[PDB]
Amino acid sequence: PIPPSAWTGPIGNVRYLLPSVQGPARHLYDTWRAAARQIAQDPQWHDPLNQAIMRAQYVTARGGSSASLKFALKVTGIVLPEYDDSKVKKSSKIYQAAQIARIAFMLLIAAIHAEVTMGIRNQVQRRARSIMPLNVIQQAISAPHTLVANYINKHMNLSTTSGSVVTDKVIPLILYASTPPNTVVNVDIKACDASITYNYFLSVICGAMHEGFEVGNADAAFMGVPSTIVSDRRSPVAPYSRPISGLQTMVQHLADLYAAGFRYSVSDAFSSGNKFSFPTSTFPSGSTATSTEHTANNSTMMEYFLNVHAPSHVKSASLKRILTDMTIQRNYVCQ
Amino acid sequence: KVTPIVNPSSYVCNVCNARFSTMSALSEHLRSDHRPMINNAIRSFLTAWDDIRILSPDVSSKSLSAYLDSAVANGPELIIEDTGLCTSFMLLDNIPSAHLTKELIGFTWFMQMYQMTPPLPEGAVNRIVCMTNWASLGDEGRGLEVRLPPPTDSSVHAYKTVLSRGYIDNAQFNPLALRSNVLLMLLQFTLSNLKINKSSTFTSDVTTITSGRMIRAFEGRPELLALAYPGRAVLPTQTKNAQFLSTAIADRIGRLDRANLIGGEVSAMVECMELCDALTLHIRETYIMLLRSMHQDPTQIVQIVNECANNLLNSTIPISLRPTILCPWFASSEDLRLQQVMHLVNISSNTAAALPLVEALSTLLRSVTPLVLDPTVLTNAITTISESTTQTISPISEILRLLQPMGNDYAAFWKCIASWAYNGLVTTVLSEDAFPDSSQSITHLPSMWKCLFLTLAGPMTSDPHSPVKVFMALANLLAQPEPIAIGVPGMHQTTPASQFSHPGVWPPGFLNPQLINPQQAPLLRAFAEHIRANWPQPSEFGYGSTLQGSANLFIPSNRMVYPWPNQPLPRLTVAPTYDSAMSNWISTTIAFFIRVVNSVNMTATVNDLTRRTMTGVMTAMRQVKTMTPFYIQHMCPTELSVLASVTVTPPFQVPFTRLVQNDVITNVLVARVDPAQRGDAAVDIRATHATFAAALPVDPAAIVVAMLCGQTETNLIPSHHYGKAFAPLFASNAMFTRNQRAVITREAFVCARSAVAQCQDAGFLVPRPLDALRQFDVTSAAAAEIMHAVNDAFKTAFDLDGALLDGLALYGDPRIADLSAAYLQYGGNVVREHVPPGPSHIHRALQQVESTFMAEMNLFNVARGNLYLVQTATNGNWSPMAPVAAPPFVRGGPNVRVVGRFGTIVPRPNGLEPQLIDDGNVPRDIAGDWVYPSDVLQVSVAVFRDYVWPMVKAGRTRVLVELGHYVYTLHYYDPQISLDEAPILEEWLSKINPAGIPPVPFCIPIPQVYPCITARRVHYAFTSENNNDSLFSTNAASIDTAFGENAAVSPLRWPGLVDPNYRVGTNDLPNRITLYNSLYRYNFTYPTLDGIMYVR
């Protein structure tokens, strides 16, 4: 585990990793930082069509779980249309995002943390199973964590978003592997969704994204989240109030959301009326826009293994000759 | 329950039923019960622990240096005023005469009896203790202060400020780090005291005490009015204060010359006499002299703002008089250089630092620019060329594939411009994924249009190897038809044009196109003929104002080099013209690739009708009327001149180079350590300096869209469009914040490199007034605590938030702190433009405090001279601090013996006395006169206390304790009651460790008012040098002291009050401190920029 002395003073909620620690956490901290630097530089955002694609990405991809705007009337008075005069399903696809168009994000992101965040359609007993995706405005506060994970997988995992990518990329790699020239190690990571916690991982990346988003304009909004005051506590003699960008504002709320966990609410119609919401450190399984972060760590943590860890830790002198010129751009493919 | 009113007289341990009269006794016994290896770390954690102090030299925050746009944006507090009176020495009464046991009527008289507060203290011991700002009722005190307790207390926590926490316990001071702790207190004495003296209000003395003198009107606080003015004392009886205050001259009080200017307006500067030391007043007047040094008059600051805005901003000043107008915002050109290197020392020298810094411009650069990109024009220019659709390959369609980014992706052009101000840190590199590969030929069509896009976007990117990559990307692409010779072996012609990033692998044909044969490679010589003739000329222009200065290091000041031959800004309606060097560069590439398309190699493969299409596209691309050739030449150098002084960091430039082999800037270098102190003066400059490795992969496909397709509003007045856009970012004085940063960056740098080199032995050329003091630990980590604590004080006194002086301990040796900068050229030009500090003011102030510390060490609870331990059983007066007799047995005297390094008693058998090893390694007998060094007595203390200290109590030996300077703690007693100093002095011996010593317990009798009978008493400890320099008055409220010393109020402390020969404006400042002086108070108004000028 990372020692508490290895962290800096807090910048708001997040902390930075000291350079004095140089384990595999540092290469985690330094890959997610530089990938976060290439987004505050990237002018693909503040483009109206690019912002319309990301909001379309949360609605269309998954069927959604809940309506926590009934919970999010607690700080802002909403008229709460039930939409029984429109016959439409009250799932998170349509019933949430239509009501988001009235209220800005900044009057909502300060009070997003819900216990029935996800799992069931705004009622504790229905006929549906407790399922994976969460609120569209808590996916919107998880938006940079998707984007920095997309930049790690951009130069490595050219998936190209095509309907034929198993039969074009996976199948010939399957056939190029197992050939009599090369022997392979099919590396599988079991329970990877329940292996990304704030205790180790989500504290490092939220510190890496926050130092990575320090580049660029500190006075710059992002997707409707304005710049704000952070409370800097790094210097023990000089704490002060810093303006941080909206891209760093989302990481301040994301650190509060990752550390409290993810509130799975079980409301299955199989057992007679068992019903409880509870946190976990487990990511949703089938969310490909969120499970790409597991791809973002799979190539990254194999890269520290094949170059720094295993060429120093292994005792076989012959194997160090093999591990010298192994490279994840040549010798490791992940998805 | 009801809250307690009084502390418990008896403290319980609750472990054992042990009553304690003092909480300090309970604090040790609870600590005693906590105590193998486990309890030692538990006892030490309760021993060396305290966090209540402000300074933390032991907390070494690892890599706290991180530059921020908001860190400089908070300015330091300079204008902190002092409405009260500027003295640092309060006249503290240790022993009131009410504590005297015998009290008869009329011997002592108090002013409290007459409902009046005394001006001078009234007791039986009055010391002058250093308590800063005790009377300072100015606004918003400086944070750090030093408040020494009186000599009756311990007074060592003021001298544990560095090198002392973990090493020695609380009751001691570290004498081998004493010069560090004293001098760091003096820095804490100075920076606590950098205020501005402000006149409060002046009434006439309507009463009869001075009868009309313009008294300082302390309105709401009469408890300081009586202390400000001893001349207005009522003298009822013959108080010994009244013996002194009778000699007070009547007209030495209140204001003398109110230097007013305007009737009705507040005065500029009054000149009044009040109670103030001569030392604080010197610190105040050198602070105004610091504060005037960054002041400019408003006739000249409007010339600065207009020249900073290039005279296109409408800023007017009223021409009239303005009395009190300190507007302190102007560091010189030298001090901005010192912050600019300190900016480059704080940062990480990789690409993590310039990449925040480029977009600082590029956000503001896109905010103010008139150039509106609109790629429909170059699209409409290409899609309206004619092509038969029956072909397989479309040169129209296969190049718009290589043209369009999906997002905007056009701010990368503006990052490419903004890197020209920052070519020292970052060099924008042509993006390696945009080079055509070493697999496709020139017949492969999208590989050729990449080479057009590289050749067009060549001079935009600021990489020094840009034209050799432009030249090679075609020479790669036609390696089969046109072969040439490529440099050293290992780099062939089919090397993929990105590995030619070193000046040694430029091909010889590129340096000299005559080396390429036209009969062999005609198409490739003419591209070496192309680049060497049409690559743009690196011109230059000015920015900022010459009056303010600039933070240019390698460029001459207030200038900026620029990779294009600029022209001044037009004020009429502009139109896209083709006279630019851009249009010279653009038209000649198209004139070259019309030759490549219509060459012989493309003739044999590419069909003739689709060859006309490629010719038709480029000739259409050449004739696109775009504004960016006019923009980069005329309008863009104006806004790189304006935004270079409103962004948070000034431009750090290195001169551009058009294709010179020997002038390629390989490395740009900044060091934290000079090559003279460490023996590195002759080695290569890359080994002495740290190098800025930063790069930006600029995409050339987005440049050509920005370059060849850019337009502007038709009726553009570029003076008006810049005059309207720059107006919201000159209206504030926040532009002048970094000038206030740069002086505090200077004043902290000079005073920290002094404070390190004061504590070394003969470091930099700094004067060493405290060199008499003891300082042993001169290591790197010892001096790292010194610079970190000085850094911890300037961040506290001016209560700023940036990172000044951090990162000078990045390498870990701040004993060598010298800021240099250089850049190496491939020909071997080794420039080394290094920057010394400027003529600072606070470093002159601390140096004067250190000089007058030595004359009055006793005033800061530090006694000088050696220590005497002889048995002196007397009955009369006993003055340890002022020995009236001659000091006995000086070192080297008649049969005086000095103990060797171990402090070793050898035992002798059969009733023979134990012998002591002296300095000459000879065992000599105990009884006699001995000199002990301090460090010998720190380790021989158990041998001292058991073998030679009982020989002192018998009076048959006398021991000198040789040590230079030391904190003293005075102890007082009623001389009527008997006393023996040995329970008081063996407690001093019982805490001497090998690491430190306690302060020295001198026993002094309280001076009595009666000729009373006195007990015979035995004293041991007294000193050699006259160390009684802090005693103000021996006894005040009494009519006359009888038993003790008759040390009345010294008139040497008060020439300004009692001396008739006192001239106004004099002091004996390197000698003793005068406590009543004439001074100057101020009434400066502090205008904003709206209070100076008017900006529409």
Add this chain to the structure above:
Amino acid sequence: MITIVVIPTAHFSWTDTNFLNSVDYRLTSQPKIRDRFAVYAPGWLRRQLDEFSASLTASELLQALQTIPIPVKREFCLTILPSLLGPRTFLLDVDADRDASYPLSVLWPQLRALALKSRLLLPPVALLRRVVDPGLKPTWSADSDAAFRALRLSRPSSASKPVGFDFSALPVVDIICLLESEPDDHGRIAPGTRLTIHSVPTDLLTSLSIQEGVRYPLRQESGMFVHWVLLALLMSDDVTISGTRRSVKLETAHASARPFVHITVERCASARIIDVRGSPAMYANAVCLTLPKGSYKSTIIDTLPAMFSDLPILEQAAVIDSDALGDSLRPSFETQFLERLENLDPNLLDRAVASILSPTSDTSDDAVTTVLDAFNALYREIMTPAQRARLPLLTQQGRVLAFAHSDYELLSANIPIQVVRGSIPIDHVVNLLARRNRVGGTALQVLLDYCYRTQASPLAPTPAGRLYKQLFGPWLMVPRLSEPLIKLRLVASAPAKVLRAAGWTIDGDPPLEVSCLCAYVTDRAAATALIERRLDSRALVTVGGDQLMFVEYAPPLPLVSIPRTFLLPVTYVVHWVPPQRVLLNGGNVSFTSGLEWTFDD
């Protein structure tokens, strides 16, 4: 005339209250000082800035609002919008943090830097004077009027009186204390150190009746602090030296020679009103405070309702101590931690005590990392499955205040509870040395101190006093409230058919109800707008086979859901409202029911 721009602090009360109070309630003390302040904080401009914040960047958001003059008078004009900071107008600093929710709060480092260059920012004590002199302690004011002393009641109530008392609004004094050491044999003293307790409630200082300018004893007979200052230290946000900005944590006793034995409270630095709704706590059922070992949890569990016994603050059975869950097992967790360490190595324990208590820490890859993996193997074996069995005690009662040693067990054992990460400004590492006669001694207290510190997730520890202002804050109102309050409660009614299924001797045809959560209102009419409507949350009530009985809500109820005039307790246990109606319990059957606030008589 003089315009004073105010930027709101971190927990500014925009509630149904005065704007003057929420910046400095000293201004509303006297009528002649209330009338010297014209206020300008309109509601239309507050709504307008909340939607124009994300669109317009903060560099030119200043450029917009400075161009607006006096919009389309009294002495001082406290306004909410910035202006051109000329000599006639000013700015005020509170020496607090500026909030994140307020849109012009990001404009604070741009306005402050202009005020530093021209000496225009003025302390909040400068508003009380007759003429504006910017800065503390002037030459012309005595600074001794009763309007300066904010430790009195300052008369918050008058004839113009609202509907109900606001328990979300809370007076807070930034107090300046001088810590004074032991006097000499003569009446002499070292100068001592000044300290600023930044955010301590005033009603802790009025009920524990003190004045400022008078010396108080700091110590008890046992060496530990008096409960007066000790509550005021851990109600705080931060403790700094007064002149500077460096935070400081102070020991309790015997850790420093020459200790501090007196406090002369001398100056209220600022007198804000801090809101409660919007706390670090968000759920009315449960909140857990993760404090390190050596924190004074037992001081505020026991001794604070010992100082206030006439009024029900908390329920002792329904507050979970952190040390007690390791004491739940029949062998104690600290007793097994003796047995786990002793079986492996006695030598690494001899040098882990020196590396944890080191001033500077090395990698220590022999001493501490053998302790921690032995700790975590011991922890994962027993503590995480026991915490799952402790799930109904820590979230399923009416209202609980759980305590934890770290952030792990609240999340790893997957219990539904809001975790707040606490840091009190007392150095807890010397408290573990100060306490004695433990089961593992003082050596075991510092090893598993470091074990819970490494176990805790690295995130900013919020000041725990901000949590205690939500809990114990408005319970300091009721001694200065002149009106004896009334009692309310919730109802989860149960049918007799579900209460006769497994067997309960219950007399009566009307349904049996239960008290889920109580709350106190200072009148009756302020609850009449809320006693009528039912609450939109389903509440399932687990009734045990024994006397125990647990309540859960299908929809978690936001703490902010209750109105601002409710005084709900710190912790609360569930009981039947008639105990006598229940007889012959005989088994455990739960049921679901709605909620209605009602009057309890």
